[PDB]
Design a protein around this ligand. Structure first.
Ligand SMILES: O=C(O)[C@@](O)(COP(=O)(O)O)[C@H](O)[C@H](O)COP(=O)(O)O
Ligand SMILES: O=C(O)[C@@](O)(COP(=O)(O)O)[C@H](O)[C@H](O)COP(=O)(O)O
Ligand SMILES: [Mg+2]
Ligand SMILES: [Mg+2]
Ligand SMILES: [Mg+2]
Lengths: 457, 454, 160
């Protein structure tokens, strides 16, 4: 099928300039005894206009929408395919494109082919017209900065946490833990699985959470933010939770973000939040993604691809990991993921992308961070225009959750001032106490801290 | 954490009899330098009530809902976890459980832990009360048999296809292609990506397809079935397509199945079809699943787990592959996947499951099949109470799509009669002509066929 | 839905699960919410199944919003004490389609994790096919209890 579904003489520069194709770059390894080009061509066919044999029903018009392999490097195990724009599904309702079609064609059936050892998407290019037909984000970090009374341009670090334990707190205990963090921090979110468990019903816990928000706001003089999980199988269940949340928070309802477990939940749930509640910050939680985005995986698509898709879907923010600075699987090069979702112009691993003013998706950092690890994280990224949720780093603090929230903020102020963390600790109590809260991390990152800070009987 | 999130003295037999836990069996390999139990215990914690450090907010009540490792085999790389039922989310609207919560906890964050090399679910057990709170299927194959005028019990083989090419046919060509197959076959479905492309809009093609269904019904005197793709990001787009489909088919609207790309589309799209249009057969298409279900994968979950979940979600039927008899990745032991979704009582790789009358999900066979390959597939499976869609096997036939449909039916009749395929071909032209349509398959499966068939 | 779904909830064989004990709340009209809830609790200590009498709904002396949460408390209390599941069949009969749905929605929300144990009773003969289909099509996952009040006006042995 090489003759029909491959044209290795096409120039990528031309395919991009034309603006008539979505381009996709994969890593690929063919099965034993299978030629590399024929594998790529079969993938292109199975991912667009054909199957594994000739069919009587094929006409010449069909060939015009064939996906085409325009580049392969067998030595490097790379293949690139051009997908004509007209292949992708459109809403009958409003003509917009849908991400589920992109997934179906470009990373659907080709993941189960017997003649393919493995196939993973590394990057993709979206031309101007296709980008115009995606929803894109309706809210972004600047809306949160505005609420917090900080500059809508470069408003900087937003301190946050997840309520701990991840499951098991009853309504009153849950509301109290929320209150305690907000005395020092900006941002609280449900842990990914917390919803309407029988031991902590939503109708009971949420009004109490709002009371905690009000009390913290009155006492601190600062606005507070809450990100609520509305993930659910039933579309109308999602809307029921959402409707109840906004009514409950009343005059502070703009401060309610909606969290959706978008990876295991799928594009449907993300779009429900985005289209039915565009005026609420949409928080994309990627739980489960590791099953394909892991460094050891040669299937599906990468974390980078996921983040870039989420921006098109209309996520206000998305988890991008800790880039090797915490407890999940990530490395320092993952900073490109944040750049791609927050900048108007950025170059991915294979494709440069212009966003033409589409709103930025906030990079949200979570997973094993604390005040001691943050200075190193910020140095790698180059800035702090982020939301940083730290469950362990906050509730794990020896003094209080509030002190934990403060320690996170002081760590950012330390890095921003370009100061020495140990010396910074000498003038910032909460930050200093984080060393004693997480001594194993302290010994590794800042050896000799006990001696320098006078932490001894 | 081992002391808290593992109790290897718990008896699995007791955990099952109690009916208070969902049990899950994984393959697991810890990261380098990490002990197996400490890995397992950490996995249990991250999948329920805790994190990687102690927190001041922990109370004693939280421990009662801790997930517990109750079994490990470091040598075989197996671990099993008991998840208390109360952990899982419930609708405020109607109290039922949701599959996305099961996914979030049992195969969510645990796929990205740095101290875990890999982790994949092999099987799970659902106790009676949790099962009562799942939607389950509302329609099944017996509903199709009833329409087709066949016994609602063991109605047997349903011949089918996918329209080929998978993308690109315009409305009139598309509808004409549909008509040609139905002259011989029962069942047509959209290929997984076909919807409202600009070269073939739904409002244009669907009325033409219905015309094709009517012409074939009048001419064959047999009822026909069509499975339409309604997959879409927007819930209300799905409903727009569904509403239009039912109105268009009018008095035959009961013969319309709704196809959903449930893996890439997610539980949200499946439940939209299941709950808003329960009286329509819901066809679960598993496009994308190979990224975790592949034999080469050590992450996510297996095809078996996926299929078992789909039944809980309320799929009327789901793709289960060709079990090593076609072009995708599958083997003969995959027949257990079909058994688990269609039987009332079956034993999985790790757990026996009673279904207590929940409707069976139809095993749908698709992917590189033709009349020559079917006899081997049926012998392995043991029956033909299946829907078999063959795109290439049908439109690939040298004579016609109708002839292709007949050859598929004749292949089932051959196996059912326990006949020799080469000798069966001597009395069935359509079946015989399938040898010439796919000579390469013919040479492998039936060497010397050219001489015997002349 | 059918009786096998009820057998399943009750933990009995889904095939030939046998006798389901039940009752109607007495007096047929007149109990206030607390008295009504108490009567429900008392039967459920021994029985499986309770249903509204055919006319009981939202009378001014016993509003639905008041009584239904109390009935659910009684169902829970009986379940906890007997270790047996209990069933309740609620009248949602009403002229207005949207009144029926309001009652149905409120009932399922109220019963929360036990909402599958709520049946919907419809006075189908005097109420007509419209009301029956409303329950059947808008709430198919809830057991539909057809009450034939009024039927005797034509079905009587004396009727021709
Ligand atoms: O459940 C958890 O583990 C977290 O709350 C982190 O808690 P801690 O702050 O206590 O570690 C986050 O949901 C994960 O980090 C998500 O991972 P990611 O952002 O990589 O997708
Ligand atoms: O798109 C296709 O390739 C098919 O129409 C097969 O066409 P052919 O009959 O022409 O091969 C099916 O969708 C796949 O088999 C799905 O795979 P699975 O059932 O394994 O999920
Ligand atoms: Mg979490
Ligand atoms: Mg297909
Ligand atoms: Mg009565």
């Amino acid at each position: 099928q090489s003759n029909r579904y491959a044209d290795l003489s096409l120039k990528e520069e031309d395919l991009i300039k034309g603006g008539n194709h979505i381009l996709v770059a994969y890593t690929m390894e063919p099965a034993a005894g299978v030629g590399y080009l024929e594998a790529a061509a079969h993938i292109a066919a199975e991912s667009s206009t054909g199957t594994n044999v000739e069919v009587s029903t094929t006409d010449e018009f069909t060939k015009g929408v064939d996906a085409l392999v325009y580049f392969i490097d067998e030595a490097k195990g790379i293949m690139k395919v051009a997908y004509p724009n007209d292949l992708f599904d459109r809403n009958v309702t409003d003509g917009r494109v849908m991400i589920v079609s992109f997934l179906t064609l470009c990373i659907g059936n080709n993941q189960g082919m017997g003649d393919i050892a493995n196939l993973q998407m590394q990057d993709f290019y979206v031309p101007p017209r296709m980008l115009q037909l995606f929803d894109g984000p309706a809210k972004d970090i600047s809306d949160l900065w505005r609420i917090l009374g900080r500059p809508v341009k470069d408003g900087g670090y937003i301190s946050g946490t997840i309520i701990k334990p991840k499951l098991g707190l009853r309504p009153e205990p849950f509301a109290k833990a929320a209150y305690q963090f907000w005395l020092g921090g900006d941002f609280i979110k449900n842990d990914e699985p917390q919803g309407n468990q029988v031991f902590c019903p939503i109708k009971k816990v949420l009004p109490l959470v709002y009371d905690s928000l009000k009390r913290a706001q009155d006492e601190t003089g600062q606005a507070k933010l809450f990100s609520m999980n509305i993930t659910a199988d039933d579309h109308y269940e999602m809307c029921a939770r959402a409707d109840f949340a906004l009514e409950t928070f009343g005059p502070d309802a703009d401060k309610v973000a909606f969290l959706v477990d978008g990876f295991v939940g799928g594009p449907g749930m993300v779009t429900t939040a985005r289209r039915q509640y565009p005026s609420q910050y949409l928080h994309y939680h990627r739980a489960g993604h590791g099953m394909v985005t892991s460094p050891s995986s040669k299937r599906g698509y990468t974390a980078f691809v996921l983040a870039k898709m989420s921006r098109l879907q209309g996520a206000s923010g998305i988890h991008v990991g800790t880039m090797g600075y915490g407890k999940m699987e990530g490395g320092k090069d993952d900073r490109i993921i944040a750049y791609m979702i927050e900048r108007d112009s950025c170059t991915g691993p294979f494709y440069h992308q212009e966003w033409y003013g589409m709103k930025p998706t906030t990079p949200i950092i979570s997973g094993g961070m604390n005040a001691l690890r943050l200075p190193g994280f910020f140095e790698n990224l180059g800035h702090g225009n982020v939301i940083n949720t730290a469950g362990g780093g906050s509730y794990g603090h020896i003094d209080s959750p509030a002190a934990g929230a403060v320690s996170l903020r002081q760590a950012y102020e330390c890095w921003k001032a370009g100061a020495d963390p140990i010396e910074w600790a000498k003038e910032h109590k909460e930050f200093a106490r984080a060393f004693e809260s997480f001594p194993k991390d302290a010994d590794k990152l800042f050896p000799g801290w006990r001696e320098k800070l006078g932490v001894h009987k």
